[PDB]
Backbone:
């Protein structure tokens, strides 16, 4: 499974660019795709969404009326069109795959990103910003939301991600309880409505970075602030 | 014309 | 060959058997023990039926 | 409903659309079941499962053979059944007749027509003119049989061959018409293992069967 | 040959005399002083549409929410019974399918038919698609049933009068079960997964040992082909349905028959049987387009499930005992509660 | 002063017909399935139902006005609805006859290459056209809450008559083609075709003929010509179910 992005570069205010992503290694036409961007020092922010079959399209309020999402299934390519670029669009963009059926695990794979530089809603926050850690110990990370994320059907929609220095974010927990494929069993996650926690047992190296928690109850998608772990 | 409702 | 048939019959004819009444009592006891756990026998309220 | 539930519903809708397209594509073809015994030329009529495809007049056909009282229920909705019989080995016509009677009165085959193919007629003619074997040795009623007066068409052959052919055809036909209630029909034919006009007879018979089916569903008959 | 035949007849007579001395009472007279079940009324809750041909088999999942169905159109469908959503659609190489199964873990499904191969499909994997994992060959006749023991073992019954145990990774037969005379039509696994029973066209049933590979007992009470079989929840009894228009209940520790289920109105055969969670109700499917509910302890009709326009071919009860599912030749499925 | 017996016969025939219409609607609504031949039967049953109900209410109005002192007045939008139902019922029969002919002449195409919604499309289009024509006739002839000329009403009656003649010609041609094809290649088919054609003619044309031609071509013969026409039309509408649905199902 691969996801390669192209485009990017320097652009003057009021200009236009076009971003592209090529997929190879999986059934592209059966997946829904997202665009997520990150500021040079801030956290993660959701941009747009296109569904399988091109029947549903969503945008964030910051970029509505200027950005356009599209896909080309025979060539396995995803596009994003810029228009009237501003100084607040300086970020690095990501392409994320997602599939939806009973028991699935959305937000599985993230590609590498390209950098572009230019010359109501559920509020959920992570109070902690930095925690010093040592190998062989246990660490608990928690974040809280504004309203309840527990639906009538019995599901609680909350996700956990890890981003290592100089790398792309990776999925750890989906729907507040389940472990992703390839994730070691030392990670765990539990919580109640509005209050969630993540537990790491027997901490080791290659497990240091910034942790994010995201809600998937309703659009727009909202991320946290980020808690980082340091040696 | 005509009404047949009588 | 009939030797296989007679050997099978010989192996099948030498076992332990119990009376019918004991087996009937066992089935009755099993049915009585789990009577209050099957919804198809005792209907469940509308607040607990997923369908 | 949640966003994920909506996406799942959309996926189900796409699956339904694909299923409808596949069913519409599959509605066009017609299915046939090939039955018979050995030494009957069964595999050379049209010139687990061995399938065969052919088309005539822009209509597709799909043929099946298996190489039986239990798996015969699968072919409950086929268009027709093709029965092949060797009509030269007198020692085994009774076996073929018993097999045809067993297949004609099956419980799950009460609405399926049969296309009958009496194969190897040149050998039958050669044996009849040879004179070394007598049909009456196995069917005593043959000596008291006469060709019908107003129903005796021939292409220029000896009357003996015509009588021999008509006797066997009559046996099969009057087994077929003994008790069928008129819900399904049998179509007989004469072939010779070098004939090339065999894909059109099936086409005409299938047209007739479909016409009868259309007649019954409008309550005309 | 004459001496062997005489010895066999003597052994059969000895067995018949042996199982006659254990018949001191009858199940009917033991259960006179118990209250009758009463009238059982069930109604349709869901209807599953999407198949365009007859349905031959179905199997529930261990989570009591997912199920798989097989049809002559050449496809397998996995349903979500709570919302009637379609999860997967698996095309098949051959359209002559007679059985299907769902693995306890939920990672694989199996199917087979008039091609003589059992195929294994991987459900969850990368690339987001479902692909063939293993094809098992070696039978001489068509397959009739298949059940998963774990992710690496499976038991099959076929029309070549045999049963087999396979290793999926190697793809080779491990144990072959021989002794029947006619075609084998169904099988059922014990809860402990150490024994299983099979019914065939010779009007007899046999109990087998999985590890040893031998036959322990044989039961003969019917007078036509046996089509369905199923264990009691206890694991010490099982039930069979035949073309006799009758159902019978057999015992393992007594090695004889206990009860018969028949009525003068029924003249058609029986296609499928199942039990309830407590073992008090026996569900059966018939060729007259409906299903009958029986009292397994008193041999009395308790209800009727009549909502299908054609032959009922398959049946199933969930692990939690919350619902029952039926399929028919009219290309529909229904869930009753 | 001597038309009470015709009114009684009208009432009895309509009361008999309504039961059959209701039974057909109930059976073909959701109890049973539906092929390409059942949509037309359902539409015909519906048109029958509206026509017979409005005839019933007219008979009741007349009887109440005569036998008692209570007199009532009604608008003519009901008359327009009755005309629309009558025309739709006449069109459905021609549609059914054409479908029979098409099935007989080309069986493979009908069985394997016919679209699955053509019946609904044709039914909707015919209902829409009949409603349009009925409304356009009613507006310009004074039935609606307005006024209009006489020439326009006469012309609309004439074109409605031409439409009826066209429907009859289509029916006859289709039946003849089917019969010739069957012969040049059985008693039940004869009976069905003959009965359908004669019943259509002799029990469906008189009302339209007397309501659209004689009034303008040829005022004391109203009591001599209108009750007979209404009796015949009610008889046809009541007898349609037992001819198109009940006889087929044993």
Residues:
């Amino acid at each position: 499974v691969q996801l390669v992005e192209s485009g990017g570069g320097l652009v003057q205010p009021g200009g236009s660019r076009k971003l592209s992503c090529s997929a190879s290694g999986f059934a592209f036409s059966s997946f829904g795709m997202h665009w997520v961007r990150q500021a040079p020092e801030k956290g993660l922010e959701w941009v747009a969404y296109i569904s399988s079959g091109s029947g549903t399209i969503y945008y964030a309020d910051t970029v509505k009326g200027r950005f356009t999402i599209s896909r080309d299934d025979p060539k396995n390519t995803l596009f994003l069109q810029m228009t009237s670029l501003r100084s607040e669009d300086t970020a690095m963009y990501y392409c994320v795959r997602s599939i939806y059926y009973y028991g699935s695990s959305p937000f599985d794979f993230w590609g590498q990103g390209t950098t572009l530089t230019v010359s109501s809603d559920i509020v959920m926050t992570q109070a902690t910003s930095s925690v010093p850690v040592t190998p062989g110990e246990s660490v608990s990370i928690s974040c809280r939301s504004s309203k309840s994320l527990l639906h009538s059907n019995g599901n609680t929609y909350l996700y956990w991600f890890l981003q290592r220095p100089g790398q792309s974010p990776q999925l750890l927990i989906y729907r507040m309880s389940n472990l992703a494929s390839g994730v070691p069993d030392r990670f765990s996650g539990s919580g109640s409505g509005t209050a969630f926690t993540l537990t790491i047992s027997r901490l080791e190296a290659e497990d240091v970075g910034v942790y994010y928690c995201m809600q998937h109850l309703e659009y727009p998608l909202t991320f946290g602030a980020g808690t980082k772990l340091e040696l | 014309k005509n009404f047949f409702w009588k | 060959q009939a030797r296989k048939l007679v050997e099978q019959l010989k192996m099948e004819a030498n076992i332990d058997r119990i009376k019918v009444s004991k087996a009937a009592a066992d089935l009755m006891a099993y049915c009585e023990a789990h009577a209050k756990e099957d919804p198809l026998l005792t209907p469940v309220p509308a607040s607990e039926n997923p369908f | 409903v949640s966003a994920e539930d909506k996406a799942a519903a959309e996926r189900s809708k796409m699956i339904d659309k694909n299923l409808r397209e596949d069913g519409e594509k599959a509605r066009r073809t017609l299915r046939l079941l090939l039955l018979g015994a050995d030494n009957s030329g069964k595999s050379t009529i049209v010139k687990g499962i061995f399938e065969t495809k052919f088309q005539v007049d822009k209509v597709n056909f799909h043929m099946f053979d298996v190489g039986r009282r239990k798996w015969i229920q699968c072919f409950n909705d086929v268009t027709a059944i093709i029965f092949v019989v060797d009509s030269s080995d007198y020692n085994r016509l009774q076996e073929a007749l018993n097999d045809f009677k067993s297949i004609w009165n099956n419980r799950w085959l009460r609405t399926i027509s049969v296309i009958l193919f009496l194969n190897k007629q040149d050998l039958l003619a050669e044996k009849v003119l040879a004179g070394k074997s007598k049909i009456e040795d196995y069917f005593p009623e043959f000596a008291r049989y006469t060709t019908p007066e107003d129903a005796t068409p021939e292409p220029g052959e000896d009357p003996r061959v015509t009588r021999a052919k008509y006797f066997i055809r009559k046996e099969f036909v009057d087994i077929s018409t003994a008790s069928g209630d008129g819900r399904h029909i049998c179509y007989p034919h004469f072939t010779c293992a070098v004939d090339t006009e065999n894909a059109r007879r099936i086409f005409n018979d299938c047209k007739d069967i479909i016409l009868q089916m259309n007649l019954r569903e409008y309550n005309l008959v | 040959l004459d001496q062997l035949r005489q010895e066999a007849e003597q052994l059969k007579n000895q067995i018949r005399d042996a199982r006659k001395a254990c018949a001191d009472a009858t199940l009917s007279q033991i259960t006179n002083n118990i209250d009758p079940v009463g009238r059982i009324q069930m109604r349709t809750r869901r209807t599953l549409r999407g198949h365009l041909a007859k349905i031959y088999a179905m199997h529930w999942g261990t989570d009591s929410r997912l199920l798989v169905s097989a049809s002559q159109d050449g496809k397998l469908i996995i349903w979500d019974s709570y919302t009637t959503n379609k999860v997967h659609a698996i095309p098949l190489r051959s359209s002559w399918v007679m059985t299907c199964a769902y693995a306890p873990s939920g990672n694989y499904v199996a199917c087979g038919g008039l091609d003589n191969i059992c195929s294994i499909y991987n459900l969850k994997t990368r690339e987001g698609n479902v692909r063939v994992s293993r094809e098992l060959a070696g039978h001489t006749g068509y397959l009739s049933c298949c059940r998963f023991l774990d992710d690496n073992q499976i038991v099959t019954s076929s029309g070549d009068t045999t049963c087999a145990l396979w290793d999926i990774e190697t793809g080779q037969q491990t144990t072959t079960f021989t002794g029947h005379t006619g075609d084998v039509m169904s099988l059922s696994l014990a809860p402990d997964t150490r024994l299983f029973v099979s019914g065939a066209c010779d009007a007899s049933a046999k109990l087998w040992d999985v590890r040893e590979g031998m036959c322990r007992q044989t039961f003969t009470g019917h007078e036509s082909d046996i089509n369905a079989i199923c264990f009691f929840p206890n694991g010490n009894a099982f039930a069979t349905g035949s073309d006799d228009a009758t159902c019978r209940l057999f015992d393992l520790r007594a090695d004889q028959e206990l009860m018969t289920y028949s009525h003068d109105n029924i003249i058609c055969g029986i296609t499928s049987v199942s039990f309830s969670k407590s073992g008090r109700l026996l569900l059966a499917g018939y060729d007259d387009f409906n299903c009958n509910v029986w009292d397994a302890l008193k041999a009395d009709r308790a209800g009727v499930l009549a909502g299908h326009d054609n032959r009922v071919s398959c049946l199933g009860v969930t692990d939690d005992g919350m619902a029952v599912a039926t399929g028919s030749w009219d290309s529909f499925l229904k869930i009753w509660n | 002063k001597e038309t009470l017996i015709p009114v009684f016969l009208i009432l009895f025939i309509a009361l008999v017909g309504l039961v059959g219409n209701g039974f057909v609607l109930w059976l073909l609504g959701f109890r049973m399935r539906r092929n390409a031949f059942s949509v037309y039967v359902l539409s015909l049953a519906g048109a029958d139902f509206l026509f017979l109900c409005f005839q019933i209410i007219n008979c009741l109005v007349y009887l109440s006005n005569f036998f008692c002192s209570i007199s009532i007045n009604f608008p003519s939008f009901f008359t327009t609805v009755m005309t629309c139902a009558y025309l739709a019922g006449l069109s459905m029969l021609s549609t059914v006859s054409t479908e029979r002919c098409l099935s007989v002449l080309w069986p493979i195409w009908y069985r394997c290459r016919r679209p699955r919604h053509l019946s609904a499309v044709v039914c909707v289009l015919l209902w829409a056209l009949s409603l349009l024509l009925s409304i356009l006739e009613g507006k310009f002839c004074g039935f609606l809450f307005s006024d209009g000329d006489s020439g326009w009403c006469q012309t609309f009656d004439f074109i409605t008559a031409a439409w009826l003649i066209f429907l009859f010609m289509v029916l006859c041609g289709s039946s003849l083609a089917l019969l010739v094809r069957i012969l040049c290649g059985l008693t039940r088919l004869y009976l069905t075709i003959l009965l359908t054609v004669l019943v259509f003619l002799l029990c469906g044309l008189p009302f339209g003929i007397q309501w659209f031609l004689i009034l303008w071509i040829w005022d004391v013969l109203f009591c001599h010509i209108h009750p007979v026409s209404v009796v015949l039309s009610s008889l046809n509408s009541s007898a349609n179910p037992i001819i198109y649905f009940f006889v087929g199902s044993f």
Summary: Chains C and A do not touch (no CB pair under 8 Å). Residues 12 and 29 of chain C are 29 Å apart (CA to CA). Chain C is about 50% helix and 0% strand.
